[PDB]
Ligand binder design. Structure first.
Ligand SMILES: Nc1ncnc2c1ncn2[C@@H]1O[C@H](COP(=O)(O)OP(=O)(O)OP(=O)(O)O)[C@@H](O)[C@H]1O
Ligand SMILES: Nc1ncnc2c1ncn2[C@@H]1O[C@H](COP(=O)(O)OP(=O)(O)OP(=O)(O)O)[C@@H](O)[C@H]1O
Ligand SMILES: Nc1ncnc2c1ncn2[C@@H]1O[C@H](COP(=O)(O)OP(=O)(O)OP(=O)(O)O)[C@@H](O)[C@H]1O
Ligand SMILES: Nc1ncnc2c1ncn2[C@@H]1O[C@H](COP(=O)(O)OP(=O)(O)OP(=O)(O)O)[C@@H](O)[C@H]1O
Ligand SMILES: Nc1ncnc2c1ncn2[C@@H]1O[C@H](COP(=O)(O)OP(=O)(O)OP(=O)(O)O)[C@@H](O)[C@H]1O
Ligand SMILES: [Mg+2]
Ligand SMILES: [Mg+2]
Ligand SMILES: [Mg+2]
Ligand SMILES: [Mg+2]
Lengths: 12, 308, 310, 305, 312, 311, 304
């Protein structure tokens, strides 16, 4: 019972 | 989920209870296809893809199977979300509406199941119509830089779902940046049409169609106001009409009267004509949201790749 | 969430707690008659906010009230002041969002805070949304260094801000900026009033100097015409700063770095009755210079005289 | 689940019911392999890999074992999925269909269970063909910058699970983004080219087999004027020709009355050669010649044709 | 997070853990007579920090206390020193913010740090914030090739530095900043920083008083003519006169032979050395061995800029 | 991050797991008398590292120890050699930083490496940080083609290097090395006190280097070190060792030793152990390698350090 | 583990009993002089492993004994053959390191194995270890979406590289190497394409079981295979073998009596036309661009 999410990274 | 015609039923069992609420959140007879002026080509394509399969469906068989997609592309103010409302009002078909925000969830792998539920519901209910607004979002080439991992599975679900059972769906998209589309997605949109700014004779009909219903003078020369715009975007002519109509409120100054006998002055200003001084004083205060190089870029792309 | 007029209640079930909190977190007593100048901005705010409450039998057909307005001009001229004066004089629900309420590190919250904002603004009242520094938020769309999650926010502002002949609840989106040539071409169309705001001329600085100096005891020697003619290119904020530096220059003549603790408040009682003399203005007018030379005023005037709808 | 041949049964008791549902939801409207124009080499490999071991199972014993993989690369519109559906139809092999929305797996540690159950169910029904469509997705670099901690398990589950006869097809538009360890597991990387001058005339003559053409036998001219048409555009050319046969009688003026006999006046109307000329002025190719050159260079560098 | 005075608390539930830690991580014996020169900066600090704590009934209305100051000058003089001097000799909490705290890998974590910073500085006290090296943080806003996340940091400073719309609940805050490149600030952020002040290189009397100040605590002779050292260091900055005195103080070690005695008889010669004075030979060799980090084009450009758009 | 003196440990909680490894990746028998010449460098390193270690009661207040040094000049003179020598001379902890360690993909993952490096240098013993080739890290700040992620690195150095300064906890000493000392900042030069310049050639130094490189058991007859010093004009400190190396390769390259096996294979290998070199292979070694450095760079660095350099 | 020379013995009771069993399973008359190219590699090995062990006072001090080398070139040259020839020619305990001898399921035991390997290398003899496929072992250290254990095993790798034991590298993709890894790699030599020597015997071994005519000349085919890798000759003979099948007609006619046509095709033997059509249809998967980038890398970061 371990859900998953999505995140946002920014790069250069 | 309501039942369709002929009393069938959908079995939404493998999906969570908030996906189906979103798709149900995406899902009359006021407007008509005569209120829009110009745009004969897209009206012909709509007439041969939406209306005429309903009357004589023993003709559209084999090679003459009806069309399956369309893209309206052009300058940002010429009227291409108006024709989606005009085809939703004047049809007997289930009309979905999907923007770019009814696809995203912060959980992994629920963004490419909303699309599959949308296409399965659009097949199951009716000879339906899907209207994906602003298709340049969820577009773009797939070998781009800075492209997220879920935002490629969205494009792959659109790619695998939009091909290949006499049930009809007619996905209709609208954009104003057409060159930023995928190479294997603008193959599926079998008709890519251009819409220009209105010419000298369309703008006179637009002036006369917006101005009717409001009492005016008989000394307005409409041909001068048609020949005097020269570059108005077709949604700015309505703004010129509104600034001409509200200018009768700025001639009788109401900023001095506050409460005292005002509501009878707003009756004496209720039935006052729109004279030519209103249009002459409204032409010096309305300018287009110009920069016609966007229109020239869209003309070049739709003259090198458009399939009317 | 609170209720509204007529006792209804909003049903916020599909949104998480920290989104409805971030929209709840963005919901003195000055009048519109203290803003110096800006007559046409007052006119559009008049016939777009005030008159649809008194007589709504007029604004029905072609005369539906305006739905947007963008102010544009040089920095420090009177934009956020007209926004706060509209929030203080009207009876509307007022939203003050900015570029930092619409951002979160999860995927799919930036384009849901906007949707929840517009749904509450159409549910509650004849409300007014005031988006500040919109040049940060809506840039040019087909650009070079654009992260993907800003395209969805610009698309959400494009979708929400134009939509049946029912649902006669009003929402008026007022926005301010000072670099207007960076707005998207699909978003510059929605703001159907794009008024320019100028730096004050030689007759609107006399009223400003007279307005900011009510309360402090001045002499009868100062002549406001010479002080209006020696300031050229001053903004509103610089004129207020000059009128502040004059009274602090009244303080700066006494050596108050010397007394340490003993009866300093008794020493500060002889100072709280002194008059602001002409010498203080002749010193403060050499102590204060404008903040920027004219290069954005001319560019904003060349923009709003070709693409603007006053 | 159903059973298999010879009366056995599969015991899928260690998985949840919804994983069995998600794999069972993927598993014959007759096409023929002669209904595809061009591409004799792909049919050659499909022949030697599917049809011959049914008939001569003694010849394929040791080192002459058949191929066990394939991946088709090329431009959009050249007919990759038609080969897969045609080899799905006219075969007694169990077909499958895997896509990237089928390995969704919102929970943790569950996508690899779907993949392993698929490859266990393929080696249960003894002939089997799997068609992983759009293998661009799930085929990123295994040490890439923005990647989850779960997709690498998917690629590792393939790379352990690719090694009872199976056969795995694929198809791509952008084949250069395939991984290096995922490339050498595929025994045959074939190119799919655009139609030449000879194939286009056959395609225009095959698509117009139902509607009556009369004298427009100038098919060499239509094979000459369509310069860079991508195979799936000449079908749009014939379709636009038939709808332009509809467009010459102004039908947007009638309102219900006489919209059957006039529609019977067009049911026998033959396609003149004014309509093909009016249809070449309103159909253009869907792209430019860029991705063709890029996939051509990638097949020249890596493609074991 | 600690409590403030008057026993209240702070409800930091809306922000994550590491943002609260990264704002908490930015939170004596100096005095404002240890700064030679700089009269008007001391005057502005005296009438915007120290006087409202004593007489709060005076500064009400038009005479409201200031809320910004930017120091602009050459890279030698004392700008970082005046911030620590006003931090020691006051009773307000001090926030040292550099440009390396407003930085995180994720999207939307710089502006939340700036928002939490200004909320904490308004919650605790009549505090002051010292943003050092402001020109690496707010540049121009419409340049060619800036990131799309530094723009939101500049917009967050623009929205947060003016505000507190309620005329009641007035809790004071004060932003201090230092720059070497003052012609590269945004035209909209330069308005909020009222009181732009130039800081010059030291004059003759400032050099003489600074030599007198730094050369106490170490015994010198009586043959040193300070006027010759004050008139011969023409063009020296503020942080080079201290280097001149340090070289002149270690030249009394360089004249003895300590490299020769390598360990053996090294602890013995150091015993008689700590009371040996410094004669004029050491200052002569220290003048011969130390040059300024010159190039006054930057001083000339910064002086012309703060003479055009400056407000003392 | 293993440990330090007195058994304490660091709390690397606020930093990621791929940054602390990149700072850990920045951490033999070279004598102090191996380097000839360079007396100013040895004097400053002596009075700033070794004498503060032994008697710290002398160094307080005005006589605080130094905190910086720049070694600027022509290429091939021995700056890295002085770095390694002062590493081996004391028991100090030696970090090494170039421009290829301070580069990552994500925005703001490069400004943390500098802060963690200085935090570890303060947390450990008296340590030496050796920033190599600083002409790339700190250039001019208000430049024309300055990247937006290279101004914050320079700002991090400016803020970190001057430091809330009294009761000095642990000494750190930061070196530098460059060939181009005019394309350097105006706020990073000032923080680098003791900026000094080192030249490549000297005739007694050239004589001492050919004395200190000659370890050949044969060739007691080619001692032309006066002529080897007169033909050492325009030669750097690196050209002399390669000159001795090409002399020792021309010892066995003057006589053809190819296809020598089967008959007297072992005797052909040990006869070159006493192969007497003469002026002929000496002259061939002279004409092998040319001085590939012009006088313009050395003249420009001398004209810079004569005007902006504190010895 | 067996005993070593000069009477010593290891007691590895501190470490695990399964890591030693994973390192003990890695401890002939091959080609001594059959490599007619790259005699400079023979010279540097002649002066690095043979000459400092016959006369150890000739390569000392200024004559510096080397410690590492990185072989770089095509995949058709003898990268394994040279290390195997020095292994079968010298009398040192040749170890080998691929990407398979370092992987374990537990955390904290993936770094101890290289410590045990270098300890056994120093303990047994003046050995020679060869890291096989270094191109996957060490890449970029400061990468992003890679897990942290690769950085830990590479830091343990750097912890024991300084220590006799002659490490040697061989790479096919050298441009993935780190800027800090290449400091110990003392020579990144440019290795060219090989001669005829061993491809002809692989042609002869790879066609057994298949009937062939007596008109095929293996010298002309083995002089035309300049640059083929190990599996590329197998691809050549597979193209010829399936060309024997595809020269006949079985795609057009189907069903009726295909058994006799297939048996007559199976009786058929390889001609010269099959190999001539195969050399123009088995084009190498090794494209003519990788050797160019290896040339630019050995010109840039190596000394070759
Ligand atoms: N041909 C037309 N006939 C009548 N009204 C029109 C026409 N074209 C534009 N309009 C005006 O345009 C307004 C609607 O905007 P429009 O239909 O242009 O959406 P759009 O701007 O195309 O959408 P987008 O912003 O995505 O481009 C209507 O209020 C209508 O007054
Ligand atoms: N027309 C005006 N009448 C009276 N005061 C004014 C006027 N214009 C500006 N001011 C003064 O200027 C100060 C700041 O005005 P305002 O808040 O509009 O700046 P701004 O334009 O919002 O700044 P920015 O351009 O950075 O958004 C106010 O304190 C106000 O007193
Ligand atoms: N060689 C061919 N023979 C018969 N039909 C063809 C051929 N080439 C293209 N077509 C037509 O082109 C259309 C597209 O086919 P298909 O979907 O296989 O293209 P695709 O490029 O494989 O799709 P995708 O872009 O998803 O890879 C089909 O409807 C088919 O009628
Ligand atoms: N006005 C002054 N009075 C006394 N000492 C001064 C003065 N100005 C500078 N100094 C001396 O200069 C040294 C360093 O000054 P400081 O650190 O303030 O420079 P800075 O403002 O940081 O310059 P930058 O910000 O460009 O690096 C201090 O040790 C201080 O003793
Ligand atoms: N002054 C010197 N004293 C002793 N040895 C020297 C001297 N100069 C050069 N050498 C010798 O020359 C060799 C090259 O020196 P080094 O490796 O330091 O080059 P470098 O000075 O770092 O070059 P660059 O400054 O261009 O980076 C060293 O091994 C050193 O032994
Ligand atoms: Mg629209
Ligand atoms: Mg404002
Ligand atoms: Mg396909
Ligand atoms: Mg400073």
């Amino acid at each position: 019972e371990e859900e998953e999410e999505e995140e946002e990274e920014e790069e250069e | 989920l309501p039942q369709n015609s002929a009393g069938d039923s959908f079995d939404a069992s493998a999906y969570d209870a908030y996906i189906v609420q979103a798709v149900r959140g995406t899902m009359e007879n006021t407007m008509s296809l005569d209120d829009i002026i110009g745009m004969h080509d897209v009206k012909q394509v709509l007439h041969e893809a939406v209306t005429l399969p309903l009357l004589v469906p023993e003709f559209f068989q084999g090679l003459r199977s009806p069309w399956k997609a369309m893209v309206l592309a052009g300058p940002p103010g010429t009227g291409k979300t108006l024709i989606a409302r005009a085809i939703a009002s004047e049809s007997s078909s289930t009309f979905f509406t999907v923007s770019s925000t009814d696809l995203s969830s912060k959980w992994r792998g629920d963004s490419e199941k909303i699309v599959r539920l949308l296409f399965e519901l659009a097949r199951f209910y009716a000879p339906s119509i899907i209207f994906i607004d602003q298709i340049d979002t969820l577009g773009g080439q797939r070998g781009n830089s800075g492209e997220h991992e879920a935002s490629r599975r969205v494009k792959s679900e659109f790619l695998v779902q939009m091909d290949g059972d006499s049930r009809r769906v007619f996905v209709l998209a609208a954009t104003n940046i057409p060159w930023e589309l995928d190479e294997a997605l603008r193959r599926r949109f079998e008709k890519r049409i251009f819409i220009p700014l209105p010419d000298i004779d369309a703008r006179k009909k637009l002036i006369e169609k917006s101005m009717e219903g409001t009492p005016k003078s008989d000394e307005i020369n409409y041909d001068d106001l048609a020949a005097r715009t020269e570059g108005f975007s077709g949604a700015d002519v309505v703004s010129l009409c509104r600034t001409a109509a509200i200018n009768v409120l700025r001639r009788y100054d109401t900023k001095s009267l506050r409460g005292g006998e005002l509501t009878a002055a707003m009756e004496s200003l209720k039935a006052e004509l729109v004279r030519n001084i209103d249009f002459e004083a409204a032409l010096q205060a309305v300018s287009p949201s110009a920069g016609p190089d966007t229109m020239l870029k869209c003309k070049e792309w739709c003259d090198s790749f458009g399939a009317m």
